[PDB]
């Protein structure tokens, strides 16, 4: 656990806190976006929204580190939400959501349903005006039965010339079909068979329902490619959460956050991308801290929209060993711990901060540095010094000698 957080502009003054972060690493090039507010992280005024791609390099201690060469900031930070970043062939495509009515997860009924994609180059040139920053136009969003579609999640994958941003689809609740007998209420008694259906949107009576998935953005569609939404399979289905599909050891792995009653970690190898079928890992040791009704290690079908985003990166497939940062606490979102876990036991862990250090969304990406598996974990750690949120990175080397 080595701090490399100094390699991003996370360090501001004590009056600004860094929210809504992003980290998307692929083939040695990363991405990073964040929203600088003024004062509180909740009600503060947005200062700017950096969206900066770069490259992953090495120091003299064989420690991987980030280095932004190219940075783009939208003219209006207030209308850019839920950015997703996918690398593709020396360009780094960042897909976000344009909203003049606030966060469209919250104010979904009045959302314009408009997206924006911003091309950034991981190797910018001297005078590459349209080569470095070229925000593409998305005039055709193939939704299907879904009324609105979002890129919802930090990172996605590329399949040759095709992109797959983690997504979510705002399906109207009335037309959402779900057989209540499939609600797993057998093991525990305080769960009605109708909690699975109602907990599938942010409110039990929400007009829309969030259904996570992918956004097929094929570059071979011409000058104006279509954003095709790919819904996720209904097995072990819960509310649409910030997902993360990443190409690990050859086959994509789909992490999907536990923002509902299924508080256990919900990620697994992807059998097929279109349609999206994810073989969720039957994990029994890794969960996330839910606030009120669905705390850590909860599996009863319950109506809640709670939890935090703690992705896990698959670092070994022959043994299904993966790594990530998870908040080792039941209800309070604190104590970020970098754990390396199998499906049924935590192998080893490293506590990144103190016991009572408030933490938040953690984004863990792993890679190979000269055939050594390192991991960069962007952890939103609450600094008690300046009493604000700062995303702290942690270059962690996965050891081979135990």
């Amino acid at each position, epitope marked *: 656990p080595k701090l490399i957080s100094y390699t991003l502009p996370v360090v501001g003054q004590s009056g600004t806190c860094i929210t809504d972060p992003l980290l998307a690493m692929d083939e040695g090039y990363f991405a990073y976006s964040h929203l600088e507010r003024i004062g509180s*992280c909740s009600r503060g005024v947005s200062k700017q929204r950096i969206i900066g791609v770069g490259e992953v390099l090495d120091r003299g201690d064989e420690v991987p580190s980030l280095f932004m060469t190219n940075v783009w900031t939208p003219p209006n930070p207030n209308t850019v939400y839920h950015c997703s970043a996918v690398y593709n062939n020396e360009f780094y495509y960042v897909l976000c959501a344009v909203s003049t009515v606030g966060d469209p997860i919250l104010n979904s009924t009045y959302w314009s349903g408009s997206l924006m994609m911003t091309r950034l180059a991981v190797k910018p040139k001297s005078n590459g005006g349209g080569y470095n920053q070229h925000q593409l136009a998305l005039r055709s969003i193939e939704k299907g039965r879904y009324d609105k579609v979002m890129p*919802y999640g930090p990172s996605g994958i590329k399949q040759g010339d095709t992109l797959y941003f983690p997504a979510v689809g705002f399906l109207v609740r009335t037309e959402f079909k779900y057989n209540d007998s499939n609600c797993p209420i057998t093991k525990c008694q305080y769960s009605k068979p109708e909690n699975c259906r109602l907990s599938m949107g*942010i409110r*039990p009576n929400s007009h829309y329902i969030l259904r996570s998935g992918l956004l097929k953005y094929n570059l071979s569609d011409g000058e104006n490619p279509k954003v095709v939404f790919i819904e996720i399979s209904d097995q072990r289905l819960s509310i649409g959460s910030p997902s993360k599909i990443y190409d690990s050891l050859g086959q994509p792995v789909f992490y999907q956050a536990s923002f509902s009653w299924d508080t256990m970690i919900k990620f697994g190898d992807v059998l097929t991308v279109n349609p999206l079928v994810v073989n969720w890992r039957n994990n029994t040791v890794i969960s996330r801290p839910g606030q009120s*009704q669905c705390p850590r290690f909860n599996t009863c079908p319950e109506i809640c929209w*709670e939890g*935090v985003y703690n992705d896990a990166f698959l670092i070994d497939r022959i043994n299904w060993i993966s790594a990530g940062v998870f908040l080792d606490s039941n209800q309070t979102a604190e104590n970020p711990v970098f754990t390396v876990f199998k499906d049924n036991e935590i192998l080893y862990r490293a506590q990144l901060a103190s016991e009572d250090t408030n933490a938040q969304k953690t984004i863990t990406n792993c890679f190979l540095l000269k055939n050594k598996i390192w991991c960069i974990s962007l952890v939103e750690i609450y600094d008690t010094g300046d009493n604000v949120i700062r995303p702290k990175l942690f270059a962690v080397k996965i050891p081979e000698q135990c």
Partner: antibody
Amino acid sequence: QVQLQESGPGVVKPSETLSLTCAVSGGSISDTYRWSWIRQPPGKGLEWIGYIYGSATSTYYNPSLSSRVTISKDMSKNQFSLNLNSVTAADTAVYYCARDYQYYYSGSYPTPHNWFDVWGPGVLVTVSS
Amino acid sequence: DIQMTQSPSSLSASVGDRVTITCRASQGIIDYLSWYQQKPGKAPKLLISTASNLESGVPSRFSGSGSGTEFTLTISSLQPEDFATYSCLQGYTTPYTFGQGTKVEIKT
């Protein structure tokens, strides 16, 4: 605007079921994601009891009162109740029913700021034989 | 649970004075704190949410600041209609624990 109104007997002997009722006027319990109960013993500070979703039947209760508190529901009369079992002299308080309010920012963060925007007028319930 | 301790328990100040009410949390809540004004015989009224927001209708003399463990309720220009019981409330986790209450008194 939603107006609440607690209702129940002001005299409850020790060691039986307290029975309150918070009638909801100006709004339906199908809205208002959570519905909480708060009491305040005389001479001490407010403490929280538990909430009911309204649209659902799921309850959470204060761990200091989890073994005793039962919160029921009624769509027909648009009211939700409270049932504190095995009341003692320490349960003398002013029981408020409140609309639990959640402030969601950045809906990739499902941890809202929870507070009570609408409170009932309250009712003094004294545990005496 | 998260113990919410206030200080002082009951203060006395004259009209127009600056009153600072502190509410200390056992665990670290980020900014999930709310301030309530409980007039005698009436239901508590929300003053400040997220520990720093002036709610609609609340006079500007009520200002809240602080985050983490120390939280502050500041009444800049105290008025005769501000002598009530002021309670902090944490929303970061459940059960929601109020403060023990602060009593404001006329210094005459």
